[PDB]
Amino acid sequence: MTIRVAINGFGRIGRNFLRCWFGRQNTDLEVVAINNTSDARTAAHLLEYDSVLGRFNADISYDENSITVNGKTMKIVCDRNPLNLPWKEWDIDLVIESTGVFVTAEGASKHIQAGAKKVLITAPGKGEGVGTYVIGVNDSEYRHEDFAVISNASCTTNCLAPVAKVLHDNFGIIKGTMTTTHSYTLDQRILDASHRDLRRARAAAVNIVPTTTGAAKAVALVIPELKGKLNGIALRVPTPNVSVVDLVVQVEKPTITEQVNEVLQKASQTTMKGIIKYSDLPLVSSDFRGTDESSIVDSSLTLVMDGDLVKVIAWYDNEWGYSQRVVDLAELAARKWA
Template structure:
């Protein structure tokens, strides 16, 4: 049972693991409210996120290497994933990390992963057409083996899957991911 946080995390974790070699890491998602959540400040029955663990279902080499938490906030759209990992590759810079993301976004992960090198806020990502947008201004490297990456996410992929591919669901529209949502 994956979430939009998993859909955001998986593409950029794939790039980091392939380019840098993830040793271990932790993620925090600042997550928009969901249908079962109160909008007023109150506790939620589930304070965790399965996103970090669910990534290992599609990237099995990362099983047991990632963990995370969810901070739920009363905003209706756009959540953020903040990932900090220790990596095998030494002597890297934030520019090296961002270059790997740009290469993936322009190549094999085009239409899934995007990069942003201008200062924006979460609301600017509410109509994005990708699962994960890396905010280059927030990429950091500490020492020679710790990398922090922040990405904004949306859930159109999952909504499209449910609306057009799920057995027994009749949806309006033509089934085009970008035009119907």
């Protein structure tokens, strides 16, 4: 058991990944270190009173150099440079890459050159030589041996993938396209302010901000039979949390909604057990907080065109939803470690 994990960036998701681990039955991961652009109080009194999660029902202490949830202590490190991070010295199997920054393959390796023995990134992985892997997609196609750097993709895709999957091991997707009408993040300024992206520059809790996304094209990188069959778009909007995808797809075998719906049903019950939720109700976004799935079908809104052309809609907690998906990737690497 115990492989030993450190969390880079105590970021949203990164705390979200914590509350997610903790409250789990059991594990082979031990959250043991945690470094932020912050001090330990600041990072302490944030695991607790959280905007969208609510206050943690928990016993949390803090000293000047680490905290303690339920008398189980992990670490506080104030330093940005991932190299200048004590990984062999603290004996570290794995690293949660939730800075939102070191998400490449090179920069990224910077925990490996620090002494951590493997890299797990909370973001699409940009660059060469990385084993981005999607639970209940290729969750099984993972060998500890392969890559030093794996990523658990993006909010969206972890919701988008365990879907397209089904659609294909079934009806056969010819083409596609996508759009996720999505909850606003921190790559947006509260006010129109200077930025790389003139949209992310633009004040967020007031606007509807198309942002290009790759959460689409990258579904090739887990369901190979898909390579460049999907390319999506991202409207961004003053809910702080949660989102849902407008997936459309052509096929070469025809059908209609009921089949479509019911095929997921099974999936929410059989194949994708625990991965996909199913919804025959008139719900709304803040209903889907806390959700331990990655893809909530809402057959309600499912449609179908001329028999062959399809369109689905699933909600996914951008935040907690994902962070689970990671305890689902971290765990793996633990129960196959060497």
